[PDB]
């Protein structure tokens, strides 16, 4: 449950991401994969990436980063009214990709890390609070769908 002012902060922060969705998406995934190498194993199409240099050079990783952040941005712009947008992602990530909710926590924190890394001094405490709450809401609603599906 975010206030109007918190959603305003979220969407203000998101404008930073939308200016360079592929660069943000790439860095989010690289942060996820390098911080939590087990997550790489969930991607048949990225498990060949042995080094961060290879990850950085991967155009397909940037492409997927764009897909991920485009989806997330579409969800965030719903300001919590995202059941229709979230449902297929929860279902695909539980049933097809088999992504534990822990990895969604990892990527949520990776987003925060990337925002500070790319916008140092420009991702204020209020913005971090609002973005964190929005990612918690996202993760929590996914978690509810995971529970429905019995997925761990």
Residues in contact with ligand HEM by CB under 6 A are 39, 42-45, 67-68, 71-72, 89, 92-93, 97, 99, 103-104, 107
Q: Which is nearer to ligand HEM, 5 or 148 (CB)?
A: 148
Report whether 64 belongs to an annotated binding site: yes
Within 8 A by CB and 6+ apart from 7, the residues are 79, 80, 130, 134
Q: Which is nearer to ligand HEM, 102 or 116 (CB)?
A: 102
Closest distance of CB 43 from ligand HEM, Å? 5
Report whether 93 belongs to an annotated binding site: yes
Q: Which is nearer to ligand HEM, 5 or 102 (CB)?
A: 102
Residues in the annotated binding site: 64, 93
């Amino acid at each position: 449950g975010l206030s109007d002012g918190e959603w305003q902060q979220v969407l203000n922060v998101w404008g930073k991401v939308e200016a360079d969705i592929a660069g943000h998406g790439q860095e989010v995934l690289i942060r996820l994969f390098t911080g939590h190498p087990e997550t790489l194993e969930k991607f048949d199409k990225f498990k060949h990436l042995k080094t961060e240099a290879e990850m950085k050079a991967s155009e397909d990783l940037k492409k997927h980063g764009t897909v991920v952040l485009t989806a997330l941005g579409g969800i965030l712009k719903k300001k919590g009214h995202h059941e229709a947008e979230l449902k297929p992602l929860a279902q695909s990530h539980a049933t097809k990709h088999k992504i534990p909710i822990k990895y969604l926590e990892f990527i949520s924190d990776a987003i925060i890390h990337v925002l500070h890394s790319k916008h140092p001094g420009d991702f204020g405490a209020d913005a971090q609070g609002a973005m964190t709450k929005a990612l918690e809401l996202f993760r929590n609603d996914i978690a509810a769908k995971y529970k429905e599906l019995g997925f761990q």
